[PDB]
């Protein structure tokens, strides 16, 4: 009797709004441009599935269309905020060691999880054995870098799909977005780009958790009286 | 009960179908969010194929009209001894200052190219700019 | 009257520079490993330059320097490869320090 109203006022209400968390105010094409997000790899490194998201080549250096990035980033942040609102487990994954420390701190600060180290075979597909039969796996995996250190797709991209986990991923011009649920074309190398991403995801995740507490608290106060 | 066939459809289609068949008792936490706010492309595995014969990527080279003026300026005067400051988003190089003057004089009706380039150098010299010809 | 991306790209200093070969740029040292200086100069990738023998101690974290660029990204395609191998760093020559 009281559960249906709970799930309707708290879990189903946010899904009726186009931007329930107002994540579009977090970034702009200019803010992305200042962080050098449009800078891609050379044309010789281009992946063919990234051609839709490329604006062009400036002297053999591919340029990412920030108009598309802005729309893809809006979707990725909106999904990430909704999953944080629902108290989902969000796992950040990246093998770029220049940013391992930065990413691990961003995860701890937002109250989420990071795996920036060597990814051992079967962390997701064999988690019950490695962690225990009652282990809860992540509900959302966010890739700040989709490639490993040998320039191949991170094994977790394939294994996330196997376990039916949605993936958010920054996909540069040499990356493969086929299996990434919410790809965001953008520069993954520049420190300014990666720092920007961490602020946006950290802010989106933190805002959604505070929104979840506000609604719950209001829903309880009104319930008693 | 589930499906690890990551190359058959997408996580949404595989999850949606097994929910209908009763294989999955409960929907995953993310399913309702994906349904309301789906991605632009459904994430379906694809195998990247190599182009052969007359197939070429649609990416086009990015060029601007002023690039012709920049190529000539670098040929005639070389790169300025002044250093680019790519951190300042409003930085203007000697070439960009040359390009802006060249553009202004073209809008004044001048149409010759060799004449529009020599008058531009004089204007900058009058303004105190250093233009050392390479040869 | 919102500026479009095409407008930002046209008027960006990196676009206005043209080719990077033999272009003088100002970089900033952000990381140091022994005598290896990691310098950001506004591009996608940083360059790594060895500490100069003369006035080596003047090069510290945050010190702004003058560079002569060679390539924004070092990449090459090797025989039997479908793509290009990249080292994920730019090629530049360290000239000295920038001072006011």
């Amino acid at each position: 009797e009281d559960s249906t109203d709970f799930n309707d006022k708290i879990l189903n209400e946010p899904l009726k709004h186009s931007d329930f968390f107002n994540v579009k105010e977090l970034f702009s094409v200019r803010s992305l441009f200042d962080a050098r997000v449009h800078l891609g790899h050379k044309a010789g490194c281009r992946h063919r599935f990234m051609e839709p998201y490329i604006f062009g080549s400036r002297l053999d250096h591919d340029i990412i269309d920030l108009e598309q990035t802005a729309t893809h980033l809006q979707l990725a942040l909106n999904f990430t905020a909704h999953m944080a609102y629902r108290k989902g487990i969000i796992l950040f994954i990246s093998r770029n060691r220049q940013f391992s420390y930065l990413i691990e701190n961003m995860a701890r600060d937002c109250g989420e999880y990071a795996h920036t180290r060597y990814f051992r075979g079967g962390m997701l597909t064999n988690a019950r054995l490695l962690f225990g039969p009652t282990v809860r796996l992540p509900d959302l995996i966010i890739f700040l870098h989709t490639l490993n250190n040998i320039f191949e797709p991170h094994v977790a991209v394939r294994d996330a799909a196997k376990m039916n986990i949605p993936t958010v991923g920054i996909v540069d011009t040499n990356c493969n977005p086929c299996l990434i649920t919410y790809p965001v074309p953008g520069n993954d190398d520049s420190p300014l780009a990666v720092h920007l991403y961490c602020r946006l995801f950290q802010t989106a995740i933190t805002r959604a958790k505070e929104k979840r507490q506000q609604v719950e608290a209001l829903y309880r106060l009104q319930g008693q009286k | 009960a589930g499906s690890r066939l990551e190359t058959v459809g997408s996580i949404f289609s595989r999850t949606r179908d097994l929910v209908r068949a009763g294989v999955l008792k409960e929907k995953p936490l993310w399913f309702d969010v994906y349904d309301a706010f789906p991605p632009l492309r459904e994430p379906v595995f694809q195998r990247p194929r190599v182009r052969y014969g007359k197939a070429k990527a649609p990416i086009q080279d990015i060029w601007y009209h002023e690039d012709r003026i920049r190529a000539k300026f670098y040929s005639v005067y070389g790169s300025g001894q002044r250093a680019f400051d790519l951190f300042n988003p409003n930085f203007k190089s000697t070439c960009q200052r040359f390009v802006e003057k060249y553009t202004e004089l073209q809008k004044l009706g001048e149409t010759d190219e060799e004449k529009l380039f020599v008058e531009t150098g004089k204007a900058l010299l009058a303004e105190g700019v250093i233009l050392r010809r390479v040869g | 009257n919102v500026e479009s991306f095409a407008s930002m790209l046209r008027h960006s200093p990196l676009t206005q520079m043209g080719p990077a070969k033999d272009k003088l740029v100002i970089g900033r040292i952000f990381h140091i490993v022994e005598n290896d200086l990691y310098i950001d100069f506004g591009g996608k990738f940083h360059c790594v330059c060895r500490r100069p023998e003369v006035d080596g101690e003047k090069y510290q974290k945050g010190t702004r320097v003058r560079l002569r660029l060679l390539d924004l990204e070092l990449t090459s395609r090797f025989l039997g490869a479908t793509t290009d191998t990249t080292v994920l760093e730019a090629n530049a020559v360290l000239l000295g320090i920038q001072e006011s």
Binding site: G56, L59 | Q60, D61, I62, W63, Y64, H65, D67, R68, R70, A71, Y74 | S4, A6, S7, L9, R10, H11, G18, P19
Partner: peptide, 26 residues
């Protein structure tokens, strides 16, 4: 449409091809 869009043309910064020491000589 938009004035700031890229325009199609040939590479203006393209460098000439290399030549041997005897290119152009009998």
């Amino acid at each position: 449409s938009n004035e700031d869009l890229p325009i199609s043309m040939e590479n203006p910064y393209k460098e000439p091809l290399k030549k041997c020491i005897l290119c152009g000589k009998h």
